[PDB]
C-alpha cells in the first residue's frame, strides 16, 4: 500500500497566534518491532534543528510529544524521526504548523450599482489574520439565491456580482469571511438596488445663447440611460472662466428629470464654464461624477 512507520497528531494544524500546541508522534507496533525501537528512540526536529531531548515527553512506550507554548512563528515545520540502531536516523513523519488569527466580522458593508456595471459591495475587512482568508458576498431575494461572489486575492474588501441588477425587488446581502481558524458573517443588509444607483454623469453638455439677452445662457445635455429606471435630480454648477470657485443653481430648481436649463443673471459678454451631475431624485443613491465641463459666452449688452 506504500505505507509508514508512524505519524504525528494532530495532522496539519492551524493554531491561533500566542496559543499552545502539543504534537504527539506515535510509532506503529510493527515498525517498533522491525527497528527495535520505541518512543525513547524518537528525536524531534524543527526547521532542521534538533529539538533538545529534555523538552520531549514520553507519554507511553508508543509515543513522544513536544509542546510549543505562546506560538509566535507563523510557520513551523515539525519532524519526527527514530534513532535506529547504528546511529542511523530515519524519518517517521512531519507536519507544518501554521498559525494566525480567526477573521474579524466584516463591517460597514455597503453596495452600489454603477450604471453599466453589475452591483458591487464593499466592506472593511478587519485585523490582519496572517492566514489565507476568503470573502464571499452572499445575495438573495426571498425566493431565489444568486451566485455567491468570491472576492479576488488582490481586492479582498470588494466584490462585483456576476448577475445584472434587478430594480424594484428587495435583495438581502451579506459578507462571509473565512479562514482555517473561523467563519463569520457580517450583519445582513436589505435594500432595493434602485436606491443604490450611481448614474453616469449627464453628457453632451452644450451652452447656447437661447434668449436675446446678455444675462442668459442655456444649458442642454443628454441624461444617462438610467433615466429609464429613476427620476433624476441634478446639481448644476457654473462660474466665470476666471472665477476660482463654483457657484451652483439652487437644487430645488433642478429637482426633477430635465435636459435643459436656462441660467439667468449672468454678466454680459462674459465666458462661463458649466458642469452637471445627477442622482436619484429622492437623494437615495449616489451622485454621479461631474459631466465634462462645457463653455459658453453671453452676448455683449
Amino acid at each position: 500500500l506504500l505505507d509508514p512507520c508512524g505519524y504525528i497528531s494532530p495532522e496539519s494544524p492551524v493554531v491561533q497566534l500566542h496559543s499552545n500546541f502539543t504534537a504527539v508522534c506515535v510509532l506503529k507496533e510493527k515498525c517498533m518491532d522491525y527497528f527495535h525501537v520505541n518512543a525513547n528512540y524518537i528525536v524531534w526536529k524543527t526547521n532542521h534543528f534538533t529539538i533538545p531531548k529534555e523538552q520531549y515527553t514520553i507519554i507511553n512506550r508508543t509515543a513522544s510529544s513536544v509542546t510549543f507554548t505562546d506560538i509566535a512563528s507563523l510557520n513551523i515545520q515539525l519532524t519526527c524521526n527514530i534513532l535506529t540502531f547504528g546511529q542511523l536516523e530515519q524519518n517517521v513523519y512531519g507536519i507544518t504548523i501554521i498559525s494566525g488569527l480567526p477573521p474579524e466580522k466584516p463591517k460597514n458593508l455597503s453596495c452600489i450599482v454603477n450604471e453599466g456595471k453589475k452591483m458591487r459591495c464593499e466592506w472593511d475587512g478587519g485585523r490582519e489574520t496572517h492566514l489565507e482568508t476568503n470573502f464571499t458576498l452572499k445575495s438573495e431575494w426571498a425566493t431565489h439565491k444568486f451566485a455567491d461572489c468570491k472576492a479576488k486575492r488582490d481586492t479582498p474588501t470588494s466584490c462585483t456580482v456576476d448577475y445584472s441588477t434587478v430594480y424594484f425587488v428587495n435583495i438581502e446581502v451579506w459578507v462571509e469571511a473565512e479562514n482555517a481558524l473561523g467563519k463569520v458573517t457580517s450583519d445582513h443588509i436589505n435594500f432595493d438596488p434602485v436606491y443604490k444607483v450611481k448614474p453616469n454623469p449627464p453628457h453632451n453638455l452644450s451652452v447656447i445663447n437661447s434668449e436675446e439677452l446678455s444675462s442668459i445662457l442655456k444649458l442642454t445635455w443628454t441624461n444617462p440611460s438610467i433615466k429609464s429606471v429613476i427620476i433624476l435630480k441634478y446639481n448644476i454648477q457654473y462660474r466665470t472662466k476666471d472665477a476660482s470657485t463654483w457657484s451652483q443653481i439652487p437644487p430645488e430648481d433642478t429637482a426633477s428629470t430635465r435636459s435643459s436649463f436656462t441660467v439667468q443673471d449672468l454678466k454680459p459678454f462674459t465666458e462661463y464654464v458649466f458642469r452637471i451631475r445627477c442622482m436619484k431624485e429622492d437623494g437615495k443613491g449616489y451622485w454621479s461624477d461631474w459631466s465634462e465641463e462645457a463653455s459658453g459666452i453671453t452676448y455683449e449688452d
Binding site: 506504500l2 505519524y7 515498525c31 530515519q90
Partner: protein
Amino acid sequence: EFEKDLLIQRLNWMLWVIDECFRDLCYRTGICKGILEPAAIFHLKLPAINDTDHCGLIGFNETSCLKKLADGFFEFEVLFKFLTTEFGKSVINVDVMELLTKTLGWDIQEELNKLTKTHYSPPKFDRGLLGRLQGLKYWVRHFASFYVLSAMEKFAGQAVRVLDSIP
C-alpha cells in the same frame, strides 16, 4: 536513424530535474538522500534494470535491454504526473517530464521494432496507479516522492550508460 546523442540530452535534462526535486524535497522536508531517509515500507513496483534485462557490459544485447528502457520510460509518465503535483510549484520543468519520458519510450520503442520482428506496444497508462498515488495524503506523499525519485535516478542514469555503450 537512432539519435542516441539527442536521447542522452533528454536523459541528462531529466536527471537534472530529478536532482532538483531531491534538493527541493530535502530542503523543505528534511528527507535527504543518505542522511535521513524515510522509515517506511517500500511497496510499489518501480521500473528497474534487472540482470534478466542483460544491460551491463557482459551479456549485453539491445534486444532485451532497450525493451526494459522503453517499458520503464513509458511507466514513468504516471510517476511524473504524481511528481508534477508535488514539485510543480517549486521545480522548473517538472511539468514536462511526463512528455519527455514518453519521448524516450517512443524513440527507443522505435529501435526495438527495427531490431526485432516481435512488434512492441507502449504499455497502458495506469490510471489506477495514478489514482492510488494521487490518493496518498499528507506527509507520506513525500515518501512516495523520495522512492519514485530514487528509482528514476537509477534508471535514467543507467539508460545514459546503456546508450553511450551501444556502437
